[PDB]
Every structure is written in C-alpha cells, then in structure tokens.
Amino acid sequence: GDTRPRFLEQVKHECHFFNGTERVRFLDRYFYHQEEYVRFDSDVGEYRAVTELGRPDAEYWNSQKDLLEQKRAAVDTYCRHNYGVGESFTVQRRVYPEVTVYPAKTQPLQHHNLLVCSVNGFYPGSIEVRWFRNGQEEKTGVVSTGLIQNGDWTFQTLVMLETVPRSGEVYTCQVEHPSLTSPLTVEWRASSADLVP
Amino acid sequence: KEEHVIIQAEFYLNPDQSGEFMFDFDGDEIFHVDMAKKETVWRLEEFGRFASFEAQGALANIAVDKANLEIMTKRSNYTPITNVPPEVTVLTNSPVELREPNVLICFIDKFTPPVVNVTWLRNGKPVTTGVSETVFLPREDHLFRKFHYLPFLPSTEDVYDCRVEHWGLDEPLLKHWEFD
C-alpha cells in the first residue's frame, strides 16, 4: 500500500454569534496538520502568529492595508450576512422528538430492570430528559448515551433508569426541548408488562 | 456564551492532491462543493430552496490552500502529519423493530489525516447498494469526523459490520451490529 508521508493544510473562517447577531466574533485561522499557525481575530483587529511557523505571514499580511480593512469588515460582510441568509433553516430549525419508552429486557416485576427512554430525530441539540416514578423525579440510577449527532441535522439520546418495578407503578419520561409548544411525557405502566402475575 | 457558530472549513492534502470546501453550523454540514463537478451540494435538499453559493469560488480558495501547503511544508522541513486513528461507533437511527425499515450509522471520529476507507458489511460481504456518506467534517481539535449510512430491513438472520481502515490503525477496525 501507500504509506508515503502526508502534509495537511486547513483553513477555518469562523463566525461566532452572541445574542442573535448583537455581538459577532470573526476568526480567520490557518493550520498545518492540527497546528494553528496564524490567526486574525476581530477582537484584536490584525493577524497574530500563533506559532513560529506563522510569523512570516502575520507581518506580511498586516502590512497590507486593504487586506486588513477587508478582514475588519468581515463581521458584517461575511458573518452577519451569512447568518441572515441561513437563519430560517439553521438558527430557526426545530424538529420535534419521537419518544419511545420500553424496558431493556423482558423481566418479571419485582426484579431489576433498565427502563429506556429513546428520544430520536430532534433538533437543536439542547434537551432535558427526566425520569419520574409515580410522579417523583428519579435522579440516581440514570444513565445516558449523552447527545448523539446523527450527521443529518438530527440528534438522538437514550436515557435509561435502573429500577425494580412493582405492580401499579407508573414511570414517566419527560422531554423539554425548544420544539415543544406543550409538554411531552411518555408513560410506562408496570402492570402493562406483568410477565408473571 | 455564544449561541451559534458558522465555519467555512477547507483543507488540501499532499501528496493525494485532495481538497475539501464546506460550511458547518453548530457542528452540522450546510453544504460542500464537489470540486470535480464544480457543484454546490446541500446537505439537506431543502437548504438550497432559498440559499445559493457560487461553487467556482471554492476552486479559487483550494488553489490558495495548495500554494499555502507548499510553503508550510517547506517551512516545517517536511514535518509530516502524525496519524491519529479513528474511534468508531455503530448506531441505529431509531429503535429497532423486526421488518420495520431503519438505518445503520457508522460514526468515524477523532482522526487525521482525512483519508479513510469505510465499508459496510452484511454477513461479511461488502454492501455497495443504498449506501451513502458524508464528506470529512471538522472538529474543534482540528481532527475530523465522518458518517456512513446503510438503510436496512431488520431481521434475526443478518449481521452487520462497519469496517474502517486508516493509516493510524494496526489492522482493519470492525464495529458490529446485530438484532437484539
């Protein structure tokens, strides 16, 4: 096979937005492999070497007046402009979660089980998932996958509750998320899965 | 604390002569440019309904990336990249139910350089039907991530693996999924 050495250049032109577009920070960042070597930060207003590999460029670019003026205007000509273009389908994207609750294993009541609250297909990533046992919030014995990006502008998470369920108990998974216009709860009733009555 | 980040991320890699030009919003791809076809490729079709991007502009940027790479390679005395092997996870898109269409996701994370071979296997055999993949997606630590997808009909019979090859690995890396 081909095991010749590799050499990688990256550039990242970043726009960071705070309180809508009230505050914007623009970064023009250049990398050799993973090493950032030179950067323009709009909070600074000129290029700075990040490593010694970048020193020749910070000096050279900062000596070009038209160059600096263009980068100093980027917060508007580039960042706020592109925020406006994309807002409706990015910033304002809200996709409602599909929520499924199930026991991890078919187990008779009065034995340990894991109750799974699978929260799928949602956007954006900010979410709170809570477990309740007969209306009391459970805090211990709660394990999750964390937030999983699917790569297609949706997320999922599985949030599991360790418990020993008994006949007549009602467990509830509650989701809080920006897509909701009203509350989202899904119940699992222990008496719906009484394997050995 | 910031609310959102938009990044125009690019790379050029030697000696492969491979490059990429994409935009990222909060960690998801808006689009990339197919530089062979000179075409803007939107990650979700619907993004192109109102927005546009002049794909030729990417080619100009990639030519600067190449020229810059040549310079940085010399400045570094031909210090090459250190291979960082991927972490691989296989996921389903939704809870799995027999005979209900689903999608296997192979998530390839925390690796560099951005050259990888990913093959879906059904019962050990490469699947080259109905598969899709993303371009290389940038990480905040300047490594890469990537997704490959396989629509499937769940059964008790079949098993699946995502096979990943990368210069940082000692052997092909297999991540398994089967019905439970």
Partner: peptide
Amino acid sequence: KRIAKAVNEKSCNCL
C-alpha cells in the same frame, strides 16, 4: 440569497 465566501490569504514565499 447568496452565501458569501471568505477569501484565503496567500502565505509569504519568504525565500
């Protein structure tokens, strides 16, 4: 509406 492209600056070929 058109998405704006950021330009890349060209490193000094400081020979």
